[PDB]
Amino acid sequence: RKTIDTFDFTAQPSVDERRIRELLTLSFIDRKENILFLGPPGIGKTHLAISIGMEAIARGYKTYFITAHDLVNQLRRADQEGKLEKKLRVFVKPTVLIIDEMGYLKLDPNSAHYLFQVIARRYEHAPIILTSNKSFGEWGEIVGDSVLATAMLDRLLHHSIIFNLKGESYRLREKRLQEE
Ligand SMILES: Nc1ncnc2c1ncn2[C@@H]1O[C@H](COP(=O)(O)OP(=O)(O)O)[C@@H](O)[C@H]1O
Ligand code: BEF
Ligand SMILES: [Mg+2]
């Protein structure tokens, strides 16, 4: 549970606080816009995603957080038990779905399509907030199918607000400060 008020914009100058404050108005929800935070590990992607989610919850919007690998794996099981459609509603019903950590783990090519279904069903219905360390061109490798990746991104990116973050890891930052 992280909020915008604990985010140090001096330590992370690659993100414009103004743009983030625009997100916190939650305008993106009615505009059906997805929010994407991209960049290397530890730079505040998940922090910012959770901050927006926390604002949504406070403003009365149902919000759900899950990593990409967990989402794919859970939907796989639900499908094996002939209850795919029921698990799908869990990820489609929330007004704001945060799909965290897209791209560290290559997804089972046999299960990558579960992610497409969530994206396709939420498409032009309810926002997805996504964090990833990979460029869009690398998504083919993640899902094990360049064609499926293009289809996913076509929907995801159509109505979207993209943040490309940079900088040194805040994790290693805090580690230095202790040592020093
Ligand atoms: N500018 C920042 N200001 C305050 N805390 C930060 C900042 N960037 C990262 N953190 C914190 O460092 C840790 C790593 O940030 P995180 O967003 O989880 O990394 P990632 O970009 O890989 O998702 C978290 O605990 C986060 O709250
Ligand atoms: F390590 Be971060 F979640 F990309
Ligand atoms: Mg993260």
Tab-separated table of C-alpha atoms and ligand atoms in Angstrom:
chain	number	residue	atom	x	y	z
A	1	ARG	CA	0.000	0.000	0.000
A	2	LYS	CA	1.821	3.012	-1.432
A	3	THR	CA	0.394	6.445	-2.180
A	4	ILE	CA	1.469	9.337	-4.344
A	5	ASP	CA	2.383	11.372	-1.267
A	6	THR	CA	5.332	9.092	-0.419
A	7	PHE	CA	6.694	9.198	-3.969
A	8	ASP	CA	9.930	11.179	-4.268
A	9	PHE	CA	9.769	12.986	-7.618
A	10	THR	CA	13.279	14.357	-7.052
A	11	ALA	CA	14.740	10.859	-6.857
A	12	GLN	CA	12.708	9.927	-9.953
A	13	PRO	CA	12.787	12.945	-12.300
A	14	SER	CA	11.924	10.884	-15.400
A	15	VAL	CA	8.244	11.054	-14.430
A	16	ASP	CA	6.359	14.359	-14.483
A	17	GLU	CA	4.379	14.848	-11.269
A	18	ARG	CA	1.779	16.820	-13.269
A	19	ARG	CA	1.031	13.863	-15.539
A	20	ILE	CA	0.618	11.668	-12.465
A	21	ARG	CA	-1.748	14.171	-10.857
A	22	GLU	CA	-3.817	14.016	-14.047
A	23	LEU	CA	-4.090	10.236	-13.586
A	24	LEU	CA	-5.246	10.761	-10.012
A	25	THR	CA	-8.321	12.607	-11.301
A	26	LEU	CA	-9.326	9.149	-12.586
A	27	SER	CA	-10.464	10.688	-15.886
A	28	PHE	CA	-8.829	7.714	-17.622
A	29	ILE	CA	-11.536	5.397	-16.257
A	30	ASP	CA	-14.438	6.830	-18.277
A	31	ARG	CA	-12.129	7.340	-21.276
A	32	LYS	CA	-11.378	3.603	-21.084
A	33	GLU	CA	-7.642	4.357	-21.221
A	34	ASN	CA	-5.028	1.855	-20.092
A	35	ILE	CA	-1.989	3.112	-18.180
A	36	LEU	CA	1.421	1.613	-18.892
A	37	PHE	CA	4.541	2.074	-16.784
A	38	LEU	CA	7.685	0.830	-18.530
A	39	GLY	CA	11.344	0.755	-17.514
A	40	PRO	CA	14.115	-1.021	-15.579
A	41	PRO	CA	13.700	-2.618	-12.104
A	42	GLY	CA	13.132	-0.567	-8.957
A	43	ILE	CA	12.301	2.812	-10.508
A	44	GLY	CA	8.753	3.189	-9.158
A	45	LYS	CA	6.518	1.500	-11.739
A	46	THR	CA	4.605	-0.696	-9.291
A	47	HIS	CA	4.574	2.095	-6.694
A	48	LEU	CA	2.864	4.469	-9.124
A	49	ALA	CA	0.439	1.790	-10.336
A	50	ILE	CA	-0.592	1.015	-6.758
A	51	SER	CA	-0.893	4.728	-5.963
A	52	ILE	CA	-3.460	5.134	-8.732
A	53	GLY	CA	-5.266	1.993	-7.604
A	54	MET	CA	-5.439	3.333	-4.063
A	55	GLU	CA	-7.026	6.554	-5.319
A	56	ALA	CA	-9.549	4.520	-7.310
A	57	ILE	CA	-10.453	2.449	-4.250
A	58	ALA	CA	-10.813	5.606	-2.143
A	59	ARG	CA	-13.130	7.043	-4.808
A	60	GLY	CA	-15.278	3.909	-4.744
A	61	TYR	CA	-14.049	2.002	-7.808
A	62	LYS	CA	-13.448	-1.741	-7.480
A	63	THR	CA	-9.749	-2.412	-7.983
A	64	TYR	CA	-7.785	-5.636	-8.380
A	65	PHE	CA	-4.028	-6.247	-8.363
A	66	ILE	CA	-2.263	-9.311	-9.763
A	67	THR	CA	1.032	-10.138	-11.466
A	68	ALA	CA	0.934	-11.253	-15.100
A	69	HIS	CA	2.337	-14.705	-14.321
A	70	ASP	CA	-0.207	-15.249	-11.524
A	71	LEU	CA	-3.076	-14.153	-13.783
A	72	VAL	CA	-2.076	-16.554	-16.544
A	73	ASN	CA	-1.560	-19.437	-14.132
A	74	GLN	CA	-4.832	-18.915	-12.271
A	75	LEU	CA	-6.869	-18.743	-15.478
A	76	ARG	CA	-5.159	-21.896	-16.715
A	77	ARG	CA	-6.318	-23.879	-13.677
A	78	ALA	CA	-9.842	-22.449	-13.895
A	79	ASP	CA	-9.958	-23.675	-17.502
A	80	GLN	CA	-8.750	-27.157	-16.548
A	81	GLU	CA	-11.681	-27.323	-14.124
A	82	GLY	CA	-14.123	-26.168	-16.808
A	83	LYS	CA	-14.725	-22.891	-14.968
A	84	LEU	CA	-12.690	-20.506	-17.127
A	85	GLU	CA	-15.588	-18.112	-17.652
A	86	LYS	CA	-16.024	-17.753	-13.879
A	87	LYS	CA	-12.367	-16.863	-13.232
A	88	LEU	CA	-12.444	-14.498	-16.177
A	89	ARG	CA	-15.179	-12.445	-14.504
A	90	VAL	CA	-12.887	-11.937	-11.511
A	91	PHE	CA	-10.428	-10.067	-13.737
A	92	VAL	CA	-13.042	-8.433	-15.994
A	93	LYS	CA	-15.500	-7.187	-13.350
A	94	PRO	CA	-13.152	-4.753	-11.539
A	95	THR	CA	-13.204	-1.173	-12.811
A	96	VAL	CA	-9.424	-1.018	-12.431
A	97	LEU	CA	-7.230	-4.049	-13.026
A	98	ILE	CA	-3.539	-3.719	-12.249
A	99	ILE	CA	-1.474	-6.282	-14.155
A	100	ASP	CA	1.937	-6.069	-12.547
A	101	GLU	CA	5.374	-7.258	-13.646
A	102	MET	CA	4.612	-8.042	-17.293
A	103	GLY	CA	7.734	-9.375	-19.002
A	104	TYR	CA	10.225	-10.571	-16.389
A	105	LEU	CA	8.936	-14.096	-16.819
A	106	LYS	CA	8.308	-15.549	-20.242
A	107	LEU	CA	4.742	-16.836	-20.146
A	108	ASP	CA	3.821	-20.404	-21.024
A	109	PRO	CA	3.082	-20.063	-24.763
A	110	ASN	CA	0.191	-22.455	-24.147
A	111	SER	CA	-1.231	-20.098	-21.499
A	112	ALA	CA	-0.371	-16.684	-22.960
A	113	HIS	CA	-3.760	-16.569	-24.664
A	114	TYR	CA	-5.442	-16.244	-21.269
A	115	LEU	CA	-3.876	-12.792	-21.007
A	116	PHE	CA	-5.280	-11.886	-24.415
A	117	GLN	CA	-8.795	-12.796	-23.269
A	118	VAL	CA	-8.571	-10.477	-20.251
A	119	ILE	CA	-7.196	-7.651	-22.395
A	120	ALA	CA	-9.798	-8.238	-25.125
A	121	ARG	CA	-12.742	-8.299	-22.719
A	122	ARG	CA	-11.615	-5.233	-20.746
A	123	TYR	CA	-10.847	-3.454	-24.035
A	124	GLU	CA	-13.016	-0.320	-24.363
A	125	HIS	CA	-14.851	-1.369	-21.179
A	126	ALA	CA	-12.562	-0.933	-18.151
A	127	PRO	CA	-8.936	0.294	-17.732
A	128	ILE	CA	-5.858	-1.859	-17.271
A	129	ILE	CA	-2.868	-0.482	-15.395
A	130	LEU	CA	0.222	-2.415	-16.465
A	131	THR	CA	3.870	-2.404	-15.373
A	132	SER	CA	6.637	-3.971	-17.444
A	133	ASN	CA	10.398	-3.919	-17.922
A	134	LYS	CA	10.108	-4.788	-21.618
A	135	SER	CA	9.629	-2.711	-24.755
A	136	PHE	CA	6.515	-3.443	-26.807
A	137	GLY	CA	8.650	-4.989	-29.551
A	138	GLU	CA	9.834	-7.626	-27.081
A	139	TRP	CA	6.335	-8.828	-26.163
A	140	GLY	CA	6.534	-11.544	-28.811
A	141	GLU	CA	9.260	-13.217	-26.760
A	142	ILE	CA	7.246	-12.892	-23.544
A	143	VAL	CA	4.107	-14.597	-24.882
A	144	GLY	CA	5.961	-16.901	-27.287
A	145	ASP	CA	4.001	-15.652	-30.284
A	146	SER	CA	4.767	-12.393	-32.088
A	147	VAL	CA	1.369	-12.441	-33.802
A	148	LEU	CA	-0.567	-12.856	-30.559
A	149	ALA	CA	1.535	-10.112	-28.957
A	150	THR	CA	0.626	-7.702	-31.757
A	151	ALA	CA	-3.059	-8.534	-31.311
A	152	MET	CA	-2.768	-7.931	-27.546
A	153	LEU	CA	-0.967	-4.628	-27.902
A	154	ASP	CA	-3.365	-3.401	-30.593
A	155	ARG	CA	-6.145	-3.480	-28.005
A	156	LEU	CA	-4.024	-2.463	-25.025
A	157	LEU	CA	-2.419	0.528	-26.753
A	158	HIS	CA	-5.446	1.863	-28.653
A	159	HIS	CA	-6.687	3.935	-25.711
A	160	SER	CA	-3.626	4.344	-23.511
A	161	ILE	CA	-1.331	6.599	-21.508
A	162	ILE	CA	2.276	5.444	-21.633
A	163	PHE	CA	5.080	6.268	-19.208
A	164	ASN	CA	8.663	5.362	-20.062
A	165	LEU	CA	10.562	5.587	-16.781
A	166	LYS	CA	14.321	5.623	-16.269
A	167	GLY	CA	16.932	5.913	-13.569
A	168	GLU	CA	18.765	3.931	-10.948
A	169	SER	CA	16.884	1.418	-8.812
A	170	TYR	CA	15.363	2.891	-5.673
A	171	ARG	CA	16.021	-0.496	-4.072
A	172	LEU	CA	19.765	-0.211	-4.669
A	173	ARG	CA	19.496	3.462	-3.719
A	174	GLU	CA	18.313	2.604	-0.228
A	175	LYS	CA	20.993	-0.088	-0.080
A	176	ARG	CA	23.760	2.467	-0.786
A	177	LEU	CA	22.446	4.944	1.742
A	178	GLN	CA	22.705	2.323	4.469
A	179	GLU	CA	26.237	1.310	3.485
A	180	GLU	CA	27.388	4.910	3.117
B	1	LIG	N1	10.667	7.881	-6.500
B	1	LIG	C1	10.441	6.832	-5.570
B	1	LIG	N2	10.077	7.481	-4.456
B	1	LIG	C2	9.765	6.796	-3.316
B	1	LIG	N3	9.834	5.431	-3.309
B	1	LIG	C3	10.208	4.771	-4.442
B	1	LIG	C4	10.509	5.452	-5.571
B	1	LIG	N4	10.844	4.561	-6.540
B	1	LIG	C5	10.745	3.323	-6.003
B	1	LIG	N5	10.344	3.450	-4.715
B	1	LIG	C6	10.158	2.345	-3.827
B	1	LIG	O1	11.351	1.319	-4.153
B	1	LIG	C7	10.844	0.122	-4.250
B	1	LIG	C8	10.849	-0.325	-5.723
B	1	LIG	O2	9.862	0.401	-6.431
B	1	LIG	P1	8.915	-0.388	-7.424
B	1	LIG	O3	7.867	0.556	-7.969
B	1	LIG	O4	8.224	-1.513	-6.689
B	1	LIG	O5	9.848	-0.935	-8.579
B	1	LIG	P2	9.395	-1.398	-10.035
B	1	LIG	O6	9.564	-0.246	-10.992
B	1	LIG	O7	10.301	-2.528	-10.475
B	1	LIG	O8	7.954	-1.845	-10.007
B	1	LIG	C9	9.410	0.249	-3.721
B	1	LIG	O9	9.385	0.012	-2.400
B	1	LIG	C10	9.041	1.731	-4.014
B	1	LIG	O10	7.995	2.192	-3.066
B	2	BEF	F1	11.497	-4.683	-10.307
B	2	BEF	BE1	10.305	-3.885	-10.929
B	2	BEF	F2	8.990	-4.517	-10.410
B	2	BEF	F3	10.339	-3.932	-12.463
B	3	MG	MG	7.398	-3.779	-10.063
